[PDB]
Amino acid sequence: QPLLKYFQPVTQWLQEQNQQNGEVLGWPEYQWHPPLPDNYPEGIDLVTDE
Amino acid sequence: ESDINYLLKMALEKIAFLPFGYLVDQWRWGVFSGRTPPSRYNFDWWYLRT
Ligand SMILES: *[C@@H]1O[C@H](CO)[C@@H](O[C@@H]2O[C@H](CO)[C@@H](O)[C@H](O)[C@H]2NC(C)=O)[C@H](O)[C@H]1NC(C)=O
Incomplete structure (x- = not known):
């Protein structure tokens, strides 16, 4: 829990970016x-290289 | 030859089933324990099957 509290802003920003991009968390199609x-x-x- | 035929017919059901049962309840124990979340049902099932 202290680890998650420390990374709270970056994880909130990551969640917002993933929600906006509409990606699926985790990796279905493991095969x-x-x-x-x-x-x-x-x-x-x-x-x-571009 | 008849003995071999009979024992191979019997070993096609009494030996081919041994991985099963073990497999099935191992997967179900893992699911109940929380080691297999709903995002890893098929993954762990087919890992145990192979
Ligand atoms: C899980 O796999 C299934 C089976 O391949 C995928 O369903 C296919 O999805 C494609 C792309 O939309 C369709 O064209 C196919 O017709 C689907 N197959 C069937 C049998 O319906 C599915 O996309 C995969 N799901 C995830 C979450 O990865």
């Missing part, structure tokens, strides 16, 4: 793994 990038073992030295 999800990211796809392997196309030609992954030989496609790593490619610049993708």
Whole structure:
């Protein structure tokens, strides 16, 4: 409880931002793994920074 | 050969059921204890099943 009291402003701001963005808390679809990038073992030295 | 056939037929119901029962009541004990919240019903169920 003291830990949550300490982080009260940041957790309130986070809750407001998540509510406005309309995201789902937690991680349903636990059975999800990211796809392997196309030609992954030989496609790593490619610049993708905006 | 007849003995093997009979015992494999019997082992298809008296051995394949052993993981079950154990599995089911382990999941239900976890749910009752609070270790499995409503957001982790399927997750823990399929973890125990696998
Ligand atoms: C849980 O999984 C189900 C089953 O795939 C998802 O339901 C599908 O949702 C998509 C996207 O809206 C629909 O096009 C499909 O028709 C749905 N499938 C069925 C069988 O109805 C569902 O979105 C997932 N739920 C969460 C909360 O992640």
